[PDB]
Paper text:
Ryanodine receptor type 2 (RyR2), an intracellular Ca2+ release channel located on the sarcoplasmic reticulum (SR) of cardiomyocytes, is essential for cardiac muscle excitation-contraction coupling. Structurally, RyR2 is a 2.3 MDa homotetramer consisting of two functional regions: a massive cytoplasmic region, also known as the cytoplasmic shell, which comprises several regulatory domains (NTDs, NSol, SPRYs, RYs, JSol, and BSol domains) and the stabilizing subunit calstabin-2, and an activation core and pore region, which comprises the Ca2+ binding site and the transmembrane domains. Dysregulation of Ca2+ handling, characterized by aberrant SR Ca2+ leak, is a pivotal pathophysiological mechanism in a spectrum of cardiac disorders, including heart failure (HF), atrial fibrillation, catecholaminergic polymorphic ventricular tachycardia (CPVT), and other arrhythmogenic disorders. Here, we solved the cryogenic electron microscopy structures of ryanodine receptor 2 variants linked either to heart failure or inherited sudden cardiac death.
Here, we present the cryo-EM structures of the post-translationally modified RyR2-S2808D in the presence of low non-activating Ca2+, conditions that resemble those of RyR2 in failing hearts during diastole. Finally, we added rapamycin to compete the calstabin-2 off of RyR2 to simulate the calstabin-2 depletion of RyR2 observed in failing hearts. Rapamycin is a macrocyclic drug that specifically binds to calstabins in the same site as RyRs do, sequestering calstabins and preventing their interaction with RyRs. Therefore, it prevents calstabin binding to RyRs. As expected, treatment with rapamycin rendered channels depleted of calstabin-2. We observed that RyR2-S2808D totally depleted of calstabin-2 is in a primed state comparable to the CPVT mutants, consistent with leaky arrhythmogenic RyR2 channels (RMSD = 0.30). In the absence of calstabin-2, the changes in the calstabin binding site go in the same direction as those seen for the CPVT channels. Therefore, we propose that calstabin-2 stabilizes the closed state of RyR2 by preventing the relative rotation of the NSol, SPRY1, SPRY3, and JSol domains, thus sterically blocking the most downward-outward conformations of the cytoplasmic shell found in the primed and open states. On the other hand, the RyR2-S2808D mutation induced leak would be worse in vivo due to RyR2 oxidation, nitrosylation, and calstabin-2 depletion, all of which occur in failing hearts, leading to increased primed state structures as observed by cryo-EM.
Residue numbers in the entry:
A (entry chain C): 4100 to 4209, 4237 to 4310
B (entry chain C): 4872 to 4967
C (entry chain D): 4480 to 4524, 4555 to 4967
D (entry chain A): 4727 to 4871
The structure:
Amino acid sequence: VLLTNLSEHMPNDTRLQTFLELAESVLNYFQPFLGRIEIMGSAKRIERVYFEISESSRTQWEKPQVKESKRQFIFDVVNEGGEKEKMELFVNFCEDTIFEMQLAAQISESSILTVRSALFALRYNILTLMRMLSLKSLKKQMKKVKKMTVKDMVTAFFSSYWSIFMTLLHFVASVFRGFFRIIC
Amino acid sequence: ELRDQQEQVKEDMETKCFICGIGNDYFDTVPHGFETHTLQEHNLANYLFFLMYLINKDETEHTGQESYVWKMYQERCWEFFPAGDCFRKQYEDQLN
Amino acid sequence: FWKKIIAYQQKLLNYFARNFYNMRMLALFVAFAINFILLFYKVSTIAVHYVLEESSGYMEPTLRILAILHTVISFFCIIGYYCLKVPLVIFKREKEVARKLEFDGLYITEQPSEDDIKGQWDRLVINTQSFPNNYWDKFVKRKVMDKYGEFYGRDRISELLGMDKAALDFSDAREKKKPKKDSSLSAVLNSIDVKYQMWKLGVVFTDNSFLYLAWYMTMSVLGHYNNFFFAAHLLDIAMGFKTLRTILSSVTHNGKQLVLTVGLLAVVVYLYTVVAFNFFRKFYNKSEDGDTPDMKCDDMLTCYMFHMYVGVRAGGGIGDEIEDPAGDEYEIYRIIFDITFFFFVIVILLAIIQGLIIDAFGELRDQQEQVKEDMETKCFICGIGNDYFDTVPHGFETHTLQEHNLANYLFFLMYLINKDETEHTGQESYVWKMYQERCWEFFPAGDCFRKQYEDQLN
Amino acid sequence: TMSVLGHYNNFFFAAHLLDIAMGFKTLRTILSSVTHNGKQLVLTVGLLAVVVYLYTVVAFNFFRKFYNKSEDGDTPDMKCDDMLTCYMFHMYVGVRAGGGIGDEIEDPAGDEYEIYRIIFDITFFFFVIVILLAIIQGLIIDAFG
Ligand SMILES: Nc1ncnc2c1ncn2[C@@H]1O[C@H](COP(=O)(O)OP(=O)(O)OP(=O)(O)O)[C@@H](O)[C@H]1O
Ligand SMILES: Nc1ncnc2c1ncn2[C@@H]1O[C@H](COP(=O)(O)OP(=O)(O)OP(=O)(O)O)[C@@H](O)[C@H]1O
Ligand SMILES: [Zn+2]
Ligand SMILES: [Zn+2]
């Protein structure tokens, strides 16, 4: 708190920033528990107040129900709220929310099958796709490839893409079969 | 009407600070100034946590600022809340 | 030989990539032609036949040729998709994984929550040696090593990234000469990375548009067997026409609201059916002839199905369908039942649906207007108001089209990427370092050249 | 030309009432309401004609005997034996009918395809009768706005 106050009040003191980098770790650890607000001070000046944020209060505040309450309060104070009692309503909401978080903390005491199937299929089908290259079954098309010509090459890669597409058809059929197996 | 009310709330929050009431552009003159002001300087969550801290803390160990704010909270005088002015406005040319 | 056939293959693949969109529209044209020729389809006469009435006498060969052409065009569109759109999707996912690895360490300091199939599948690609295949930065495997080498161990990061740090020392040392040529089929097979291709095939199969095109293929193939499966190809107008896409986005914008409204309508009518089952049973007699009693509400399920199918579709309501209540003990209760049914189910709920649709139109229009006036009043990068620039005539347009053009920023990014790192200037190196560390502070925010040098320029 | 032809046939003079659109600007606002989204309305009508064609195809494939419109059982009059006749019937009858095609064609009770027929009718009513007309009216209202 002392170091943060000094750093904020003097923003451009080189010795201050150096001593701050010497003091990085403690500041980083205490940043979540450190809060700062600006109040209308007695000296007719705006002053900053540094205080302790408790872990329980922060968790209860971050709980979703309190977030919904905050959204509802903001909507209400914006739509049917006036500047005369806007901040009064804010204080009332703050008090009610503090009471409910104190009650909640007090009362509080202390697909994988589908992923496996879809990954096994995506492995096995591609293994079968590359299995003919693994066996070196392209030696049959080798003798025909020896006749280099445009029509032979176009039919050859059309046959290759046809093999890819029939492998895709086997994949989608196996997906449907597995879906039916899960159903039954 | 419901949709317009939601949009009104949205752009009101995104253009005016909830407590300050100051426009977003003045803070945005410095990059990310509006978000810095709304999430670090004048966070309503921070104000609520300060109210909790005052309530939980014993009255004897209240500091000067804590006692001052506690007296105005107990008399229900919300003048201590910043209205129209902020730290950046008050110390503009010293900070900048 | 290899160098000519591979070149011609690349030419053909490039042709398909270039003509992907044109063939996509022409497939729709062929679909409209086949559906138009199917408009004359007729049932011939148990023995069930199906023969077209051919006034010209050549309609049957005509749509046979049309179906074969449509199927071939589907294959060409499948090829063109893999030519053009697949590299972009692969680049996107590959760069996203690279960034998550270098900056978030999703495989060293974090592990996928096992509900993200994308991450579970992308765990495979890191081990491959063909990574940054599409992403320009081939240096991610070294960035991760430098960033996280000490805390997890050079050996562990090298094993996770599948890099041969042991061979790096031998490479820097004296490495023996070996014969190597790409003419060998074994050599080209070793050059092909089986696991990276496996990952790429998985990503492509996961891709939604590829699934849509495969469904188009399957429907065309089934349409060859049964000619009426070709009608499903008319469902492609939603994506072919963006003007129709606006109309469809009107109803899909509030699709959840519409589905919930239908569920609420089904629940309210179920409550009404329960009330009728409890009290108004003899009123639901639908027997045209008094001799044969046909009761539609003896059973809960039958009564509910009748309520849906008849009352929900009927304009007047369930009262205009079921029997008249005159001269009965439950006359007033029946009348109130009918009036409430008509007001709630027939009027309000349909009004709710139509109002949701209209509100969706309005919200889309307001969003477009918001984007329009936001662009016309604020500079995209500066964030400065238009009036300050407009103090000088045409100042806002000059600032937005000459000084801070997003096209100019994009071209600068391209220039940095294309340019060699050695010849980077001071500004180029500075911006390149912040781009590589993903720090966007170099982008002007709230300030510009005119603001900084106002009184000197003016 | 219309006046000259109206001399020959007196009923050609009715087309001169189409001049109110330009004579009255107050009527011109009402007409500009629908012509502002004229392209959207035409595309909506085309989409309605395509969806009903898909429904007609489904009926032609499965629900054929249901489309029997014979008042007397002696004379069979089938409205969906031919693709074109079935589509024209779907348009002229179902699109104009408030309840849908189900309130027009025969009842499904005691049949194998009962549930499929019911789902067909419900989907037809929700999409064609309700949503598409709602789309058109919403386009018109959005044009006013
Ligand atoms: N005192 C304030 N505290 C926080 N945000 C404020 C405040 N005053 C105005 N805002 C506006 O609200 C924005 C974020 O706060 P807000 O509660 O509206 O967001 P949210 O999306 O509901 O947040 P969350 O992720 O906590 O649910 C800020 O960026 C700012 O535009
Ligand atoms: N960085 C920017 N570059 C260009 N225009 C910008 C930029 N920032 C804001 N604008 C606004 O956008 C207008 C033109 O750009 P925009 O891309 O919106 O127009 P367009 O009509 O879509 O252009 P085009 O004819 O290229 O399709 C400018 O006049 C300005 O109001
Ligand atoms: Zn503030
Ligand atoms: Zn700019």
